[model samples]
Target: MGKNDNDALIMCMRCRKVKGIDSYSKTQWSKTFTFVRGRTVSVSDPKVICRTCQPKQHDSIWCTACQQTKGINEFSKAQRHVLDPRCQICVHSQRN
Candidate 1:
């Protein structure tokens, strides 16, 4: 699939099936590099994700603070409609 395809859904590398993004956790660690007119800028924010592809040994996707391992909870919505019911758990828990 091409990067520009909006209808595309990513298969969980472990589950071997298409899973929603809410199935993962959010990450705030990001960096950007730009160089023009001798100026540069970088920005980052918490992005939604699922943990299926992350290696078992690495604690990269889920939030260790919330102790959420089943799916993303207490993370901001992605500004898009979620098709899965489990997605609401994450959105609602954010209010807690």
Candidate 2:
């Protein structure tokens, strides 16, 4: 068995690169359960970008370089897919 063997694998819409399902954001996927009559359910979808790129209704942060909408997580962070409590760009700029 190998990472690429699964048919469920997909290329990230934002990064334009292929990644395994784990690389996608698990948080946004939960939105789908809201329609199920108040029963909490886990969602399963792999649209891994920033919140702004997501089709759901949320505020957006702009990325000048990518020319795409993004959320706090889209900015650089200590961990992958996580935005630092501080702004991403600000952290990098202040590193010097």
Candidate 3:
């Protein structure tokens, strides 16, 4: 298939299944470091991998207040770096 084709398929390394390119996530290869006489040196080539077996970041979460399972994105940010237990809908309703 052509590179620009929307129906292009790629294979997953773990699942070994052929799927659409959109179904895979692009991951950069890790660099290998070598230590020589107390000096660290990187000695590996970089490559890209298509990940398909990995789980989505917003797959699911359990809300403490509502006692229901919901998507991670459904929860609000309690703080700059923290996720709120209750979803946005529940939190807004509680405030009203």
Candidate 4:
């Protein structure tokens, strides 16, 4: 059985269901832009809609380094409460 975390519980507007947002979608990776903002996704967070209920393509964060909007997962670890300025590739791409 998969353990649950209260912090990640994302409320779906369409389905009207409460579920933790695990396994971030590659379609929109960066964790900072998922309506999470800076305060993070709390139970009282406005517009508590998850990926499936919403258009995954429309949701994305801009990379400070590359100037390209990428998924939250690319900027930070998957299913993270992260808020990084630069995308992960911008930080790690040149490591040789």
Best by lDDT: 3
Ranking under TM-score, best-scoring first? 3, 4, 2, 1
Model 1: which residue pairs collide?
24-49, 24-50
Worst 10 residues of 4 by lDDT: 23-32
Candidate 2 RMSD computed on C-alpha atoms after optimal superposition onto the true structure: 13.1
How would you encode candidate 1's per-residue C-alpha lDDT over 2-78 as one tens digit per residue? 36633334444455656433454424111222446787543332222347456475222344334444433333344
The candidate with the higher lDDT, 2 or 4, is 4
The order of the candidates by lDDT, greatest first, is 3, 4, 2, 1
C-alpha TM-score for every candidate? 0.21, 0.24, 0.33, 0.29
List candidate 1 segments past 4 Å from native.
Answer: 1-8, 27-96
lDDT of 4 by residue, 1-96 (tens): 236542455445668876654533433223324445564452334454556666645456766577787876665654234454567777676461
* Residue range 6-78, candidate 2, lDDT tens digits: 3344456676766444554546433323445766454555345644445766655555443556664555544
lDDT of model number 2: 0.49
RMSD each, Å: 16.0, 13.1, 9.4, 14.6
Number of backbone-clashing residue pairs for each candidate, in the order shown = 2, 0, 0, 8
Best by TM-score: 3
Query: Model 2 reaches what TM-score against the true structure?
Result: 0.24
TM-score of decoy 4: 0.29
- What's the lDDT for residue 6 in model 1? 34
